[PDB]
Write a protein that binds this DNA or RNA. Structure first.
Length: 184
RNA sequence: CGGUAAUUCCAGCUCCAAUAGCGUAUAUUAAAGUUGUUGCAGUUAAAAAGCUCGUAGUUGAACUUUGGGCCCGGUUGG
């Protein structure tokens, strides 16, 4: 089972979570149907303030639309089984380097593989249930940048307590500071 | 400027400027932001074409690897 729900089974933490999938799939006749085709590729643990950790789960991008039907419940369940964790799902995306004037030619680089485009999609996935309603960028006199992301005040209670963990996760993946705000 | 009564003509004194050199004519440069790339002007002083379309010419919005770590590291100053 486990090596057939992982796209590879190299390490034990994925085996723990893989088991939880198999367990939960039995506990309800509903999940027995929905969860069966899903798979995930890798997991990374990122430490954050207050001693907690983020379970960043990486998913094949053509299947991402499936998880969005089951991402609720799954977060409820997994945060019980792995006590003191925050769980978030991310699609894996390529990024291709920018061509130099010296390089030999290759097929034209699709715009979705640019670095700017990929980082925007990452941020969209973190806050998944809510929509982003705007962005700001601040250029401080010290010579450094901060982004502010504004969230739709809808169902925010599902993520309202996680925001500090999102800041830490995003920094690890990119090196960029962000803060979250919720317009009334 | 000069028609008597001359600070301007003519002469005599005195004085000034450059000086082995000084003056005149013609051309050209600066002065000239009176040819304007730097850098002009066009209500009333010279100068916006009766009006619109349109080829050559001149000109044309934004976007694609950014940021963060670790070594070596030359020059100058204390």
């Amino acid at each position: 089972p486990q090596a057939k729900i992982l796209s590879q089974a190299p390490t034990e933490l994925e085996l723990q979570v893989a088991q939880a999938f198999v367990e939960l799939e039995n506990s309800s006749p509903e999940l027995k149907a929905e969860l069966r085709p899903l798979q995930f590729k890798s997991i990374r643990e990122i430490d954050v303030a207050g001693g907690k950790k983020a379970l960043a789960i990486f998913v094949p991008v053509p299947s991402l639309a499936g998880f969005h039907k089951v991402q609720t419940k799954l977060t409820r369940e997994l945060e019980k089984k792995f006590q003191d964790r925050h769980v978030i799902f991310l699609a894996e995306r390529r990024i291709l380097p920018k061509p130099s004037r010296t390089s030999r030619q290759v097929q034209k680089r699709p715009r979705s593989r640019t670095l700017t485009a990929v980082h925007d999609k990452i941020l969209e996935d973190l806050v998944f249930p809510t929509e982003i309603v705007g962005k700001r960028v601040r250029y401080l006199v010290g010579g450094n940048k901060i982004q502010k992301v504004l969230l739709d005040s809808k169902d925010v209670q599902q993520i309202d307590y996680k925001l500090e963990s999102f800041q830490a996760v995003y920094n690890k993946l990119t090196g960029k500071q962000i803060v979250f705000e919720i317009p009334s």
